[PDB]
Design a protein around this nucleic acid. Structure first.
Lengths: 207, 186, 167, 125
RNA sequence: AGCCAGAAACCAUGCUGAUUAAACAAUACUAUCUUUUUUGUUUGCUAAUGUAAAAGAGAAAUUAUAUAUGUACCGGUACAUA
RNA sequence: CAUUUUUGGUAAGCAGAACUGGCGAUGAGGGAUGCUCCUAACGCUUGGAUAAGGUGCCUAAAUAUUCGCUCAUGAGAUCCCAUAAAAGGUGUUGGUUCAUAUGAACUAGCCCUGAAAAUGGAUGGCGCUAAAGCGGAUUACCGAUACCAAGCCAUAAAAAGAAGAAAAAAUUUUUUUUUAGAAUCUUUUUAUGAGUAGAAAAUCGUGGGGUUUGUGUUGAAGCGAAAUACGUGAGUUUUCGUGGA
RNA sequence: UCGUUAAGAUGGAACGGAUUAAGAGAGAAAACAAGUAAAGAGGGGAAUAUUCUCUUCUUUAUUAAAAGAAACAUCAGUGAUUAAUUUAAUUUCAAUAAAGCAAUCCCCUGAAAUUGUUUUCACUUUCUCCCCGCACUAAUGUGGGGAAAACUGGCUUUAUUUCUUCAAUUAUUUUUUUUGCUGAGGAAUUUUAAAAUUAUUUGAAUUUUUCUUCUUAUAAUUUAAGUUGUUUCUAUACAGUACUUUCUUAACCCACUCGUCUUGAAACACGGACCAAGGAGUCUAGCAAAUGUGCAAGUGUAUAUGAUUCUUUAAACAUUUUACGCA
């Protein structure tokens, strides 16, 4: 569903209302006057086939391949775990640098696109959202040092949503590993971290 | 910056609310302000404005004067935003209908005896909402004795201002500077 | 026929006649703009304040843009106006209903080529409070016609280019 | 600078200082308006004892409200707490400095029952 | 444009000071002392922390400027080289 | 006191006037520095874009672009404003007029000479010559308590006013929040905000009094140190310590 | 004013202002967790000494939830940016590839015989040729003197514009790339009505349309009708090194002794070593206006009398049917 004012064609999503305020005289009221929020949209080059740099977290500067835009403006990404150790991660556009390089411009891999899409198709935004009960169990351990790290990983490992996601991640890896690997230079490139040496001029380069 | 007369703050003049601390008078200004604000009638606003006025401005009114004013329409009700005072010059009175702030004791007795009607402002409001068939009156205002010392200064040509004196006999302010004989005349 | 006049100069140190003319002209605060009906009388008054004002001829696009984007209008009771940004028609459909020139477009039409209902419509708008120019002036010190950098007086056509920078 | 917290903006902190109280002992620290034929401070010289003035004032819909989010009320007797049951969500009691410990305890206890905040809670125990 | 001789003047030389440089070198002799590893620096005292500058903080010809540099012969000549 | 008009006086930061603006009583930005010059007049803030003025470094912006001129063995460099003339120059640069690609004569730009003073020494300083000099033109930029947008405050005016359920949480039924009508008052709107001499209003505090309803020996007043305290502010409030009515 | 200890500072003044910092103290009243259950300790209220019911403190554990701050995203408002765009208008152009035209010729531009207009001769190249100077030049060429041509330039035609052009400036318009800052308010009957947009529905119009217009009806929505959402974190905390905040030094930038008389004071003007307490527009008389208050052609009850008035009370109360003041 959409509104098309001045030819823009913005596209509407049903969004909840959650903030309440004490109102002018008597009771309280919901803040929102609206119900439909405009959909996010993206940087022009972002699509399934691209390899991208992860810029923020612990895995920073790894080169991971984009998978599914997960409806809500958040995307999924994998630099196949069995090649490169990057898991099935959800990440935002503005923490991820998408390159011009596309996985499906390699012709052995270009046959395998639909299958990659089906494996991707099953996972969704709701699979990544952490469950409150699990968090509470984890918190309830806190109140020696090795045990804490071990326990936390054990609790995370137990989770069904993690297990389900992990199964998919392994399946994608299983599909891809030899085919990516065989093109040796490309394999090394994927494995190797992004960097920013004294040679580079960030603004100047056509990244 | 900008340039405006009194830097853009408007200056209204005269009263802003009543000074009087009297509860009854406070009640009356509240009532008439309410009538003024709700109705568009000019009667209500003027009554409200006049009601606020200080003590010198609302004068006492003589009965005789009131009769002279009511004479050409004696069916109707005089309202007077002051006190009405009695008169011994007035021989008789032809049953007037008067709203006033305050009645001198003798006047009320006379008006009542004549078969007339003495209204307080609350009563006037209740009976008549917009001043319908009413006549607003007020007495001699400038005629107060104090004002005769005002205006173009005493002893500046022709001007009729009263001086101020200890007493008005022949040795007090009646020689040099008030006649041809002794220096300049008045 | 019309002339948009922009003031150029501070409150301080102003000759007394010039101050009086400014008050009639209706440009008080220092970057204020107003439309003025060209005549003989208006032009002479304008001549007196000349070294202190730029002015010129609008063109249709300039009027339309200025009226929408920076027009304010006098809302309240007689000589106690209060300043409201135009925003919608019911304001002007009140005051200019009698003169049959209500509608904001209709106000553009009356102003741009001087219509019969000019005095009210000009009066009714609040004076334009303008923002400074993006690439600045050149010199409030001199006339536009002085061959130096300079700005004061008649700029005829070029007033629009200046207005577009400083809208 | 401005000291925002949530719904509470207060514009100014650092309590205004009587000029010259830095460098003479006799000059009292709490404010005074300088008069003076010519003196810096009245004349608003750059960077010197900036004069208070009304426009600094707190917003009129939040004028006196403590970070408690409830108006402070001083209490020296349990009878005086009879109104404030009906405003327990919006006024908070402070127990008056004079009040002796036996009485003070009683006031704290009544307040707790009544579900109203007590700010100087631990006082004199 | 290029130059020269030329004054009790100027600056050295000379001479005085140099905790005027919060300046500095050499040398004689001397007080656990030195190195590596580990853990730590989360009664006035008796364990103990600071950075005006870490994130690849990369780069020894040398000489001109209306020409330079090597190399080979004997600043000259020839040939390369920026 | 400044421009302009102006009388006396050799002149004077001198004496006396005229018109206007200032300054006085007025900050702020610029003029290096300054009572008067320029810009611009000031509630408290946030962002924007400028003026006056700058943009080699001190110093925020250009070692900008573009065409000229200028070497100084005491260059020159910013209104007011912080000196310089008559007279010279086969210095260089343009002109203009004459004569037979040179001799004449003039002319005005920079430059030079004319150009001497006392503590050491002042383009504001360092410095600057393919200028950071002088004369332009071209852009771009930096740059205020001024300007625009927005918030907040007070002031001024204006609109305008003398009775009912809203939401959320639980598990359709229970719970939680609020539920306004004080007229010198409440809601809202828009404009506006310099100040000595001066005037006013609104507050605030001290000794005592009537009236009211309270704190005191499980410690009053006072005092010392304070406090996530409140107020624009005078102040008010409170904690701990002292204190003994 | 001075001592002790501790902490800090320390290059010819000291403090200061505006803004942060690093220390050092303080603190939980907003700065997480209502209830529910288990079982201890208390307190109450009601029903007709014991049933019911409301509670506060403790404990165990056990689910809420909200709140602020982040981060990104969506709007709206205000900006900055870098790309653009419509049909006009204004002496624009330029190739393209086939033809042609004139030779100091041509588009132009020079110099000459109440302003038009025409005519004279003047103006191009050259990597061409010739002659003298024969290498004479700064010159991979040349000084002088002659010719030549139309390659080059200029014009006329005919097609052609993505080979390459299609400008520039106004005019009227229409977008777009990044992006900075802002979010007051909170609508018991103007947070509606209308606008806009969507899916339908009816009739016209005309630029004739996958953003065509209007208007006929119905639903919805936001571009209307001032910011909302998701996820973290603080935190499964109880005050900690986090967080608030005082003080403390710093650091950038600024900043002259107050009072004072004065045209003009930071002054080489005067008064001020320091501190504490005291310390200066009052009271009466008579007059005035202002304003308040009572009465009103009157007004004031004077002196004084009178009272079961006699702590207060040295006040209050009272005044047989033209005293005096002012009016």
């Amino acid at each position: 569903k959409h509104y098309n004012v001045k030819g823009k064609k913005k596209v509407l999503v049903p969004v909840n209302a959650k903030k309440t305020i004490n109102k002018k005289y008597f009771g309280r009221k919901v803040a929102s006057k609206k119900k439909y929020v405009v959909q996010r949209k993206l940087r022009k080059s972002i699509e399934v086939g691209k390899v991208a740099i992860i810029l923020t977290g612990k895995h920073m500067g790894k080169r991971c391949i984009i998978t599914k835009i997960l409806n809500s403006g958040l995307l999924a990404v994998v630099g196949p775990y069995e090649i490169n150790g990057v898991p099935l991660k959800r990440v935002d556009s503005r923490y991820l640098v998408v390159t011009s390089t596309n996985i499906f411009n390699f012709e052995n891999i270009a046959k395998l696109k639909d299958d990659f899409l089906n494996y991707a198709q099953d996972i969704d935004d709701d699979s990544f959202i952490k469950t409150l009960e699990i968090k509470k169990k984890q918190k309830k351990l806190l109140k020696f040092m090795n045990n804490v790290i071990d326990k936390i990983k054990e609790i995370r490992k137990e989770d069904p949503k993690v297990q389900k996601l992990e199964g998919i991640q392994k399946d994608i890896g299983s599909l891809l590993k030899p085919e990516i690997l065989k093109n040796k230079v490309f394999a090394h490139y994927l494995k190797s971290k992004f960097t920013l040496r004294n040679d580079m001029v960030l603004h100047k380069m056509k990244f | 910056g900008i340039a405006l007369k009194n830097v853009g703050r408007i200056k209204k003049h005269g009263r802003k609310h009543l000074v009087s601390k009297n509860p009854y008078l406070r009640l009356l200004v509240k009532l008439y302000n309410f009538l003024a604000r709700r109705t568009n009638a000019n009667f209500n606003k003027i009554i409200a404005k006049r009601l606020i006025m200080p003590k010198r401005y609302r004068p006492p009114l003589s009965l005789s004067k009131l009769q002279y004013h009511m004479a050409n329409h004696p069916n109707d009700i005089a309202v007077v935003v002051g006190s009405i005072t009695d008169d011994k010059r007035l021989f008789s009175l032809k049953q007037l209908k008067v709203c006033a702030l305050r009645f001198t004791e003798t006047a009320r007795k006379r008006i009542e005896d004549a078969g007339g009607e003495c209204l307080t402002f609350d009563q006037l409001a209740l009976k008549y909402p917009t001043g319908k068939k009413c006549v607003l009156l007020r007495g001699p205002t400038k005629a107060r004795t104090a004002e005769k010392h005002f205006g173009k200064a005493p002893g500046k040509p022709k001007s009729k201002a009263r001086p101020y004196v200890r007493s008005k006999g022949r040795k007090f302010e009646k020689a040099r500077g008030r006649r041809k004989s002794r220096a300049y005349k008045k | 026929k019309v002339v948009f006049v922009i003031r150029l100069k501070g409150v301080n140190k102003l000759p007394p006649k010039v101050r009086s003319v400014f008050r009639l002209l209706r440009l008080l605060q220092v970057h204020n703009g107003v439309f003025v009906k060209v005549n003989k009388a208006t032009k002479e008054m304008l001549k007196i304040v000349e070294p202190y004002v730029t002015y010129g001829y609008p063109t249709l696009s300039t009027v339309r843009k200025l009226l929408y984007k920076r027009g304010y209008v006098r809302v309240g009771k007689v000589r106690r106006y209060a300043r409201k940004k135009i925003q919608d028609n019911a304001d002007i459909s009140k005051h200019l209903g009698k003169y049959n020139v209500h509608g904001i477009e209709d106000m553009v039409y009356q102003l741009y080529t001087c219509g019969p209902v000019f005095k009210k419509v000009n009066n009714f708008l609040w004076a334009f409070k303008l923002k400074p120019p993006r690439k600045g002036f050149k010199a409030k010190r001199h006339a536009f016609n002085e061959p130096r950098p300079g700005d004061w007086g008649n700029r005829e056509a070029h007033i629009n280019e200046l207005i577009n920078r400083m809208i | 600078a401005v000291k925002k917290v949530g719904k509470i903006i207060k514009k100014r902190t650092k309590k205004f200082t009587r000029f010259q109280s830095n460098r003479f002992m006799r000059v009292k620290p709490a404010w005074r308006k300088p008069r003076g034929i010519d003196c810096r401070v009245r004349r608003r010289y750059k960077g010197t004892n900036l004069m208070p003035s009304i426009g600094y004032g707190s917003n009129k819909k939040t004028k006196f409200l403590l970070p408690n989010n409830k108006y402070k009320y001083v209490v020296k007797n349990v009878k005086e707490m009879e109104p404030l049951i009906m405003n327990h969500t919006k006024y908070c009691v402070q127990i008056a400095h004079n009040v002796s410990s036996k009485k003070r305890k009683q006031i704290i206890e009544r307040a707790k029952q009544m579900n109203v905040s007590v700010i100087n809670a631990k006082a004199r125990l």
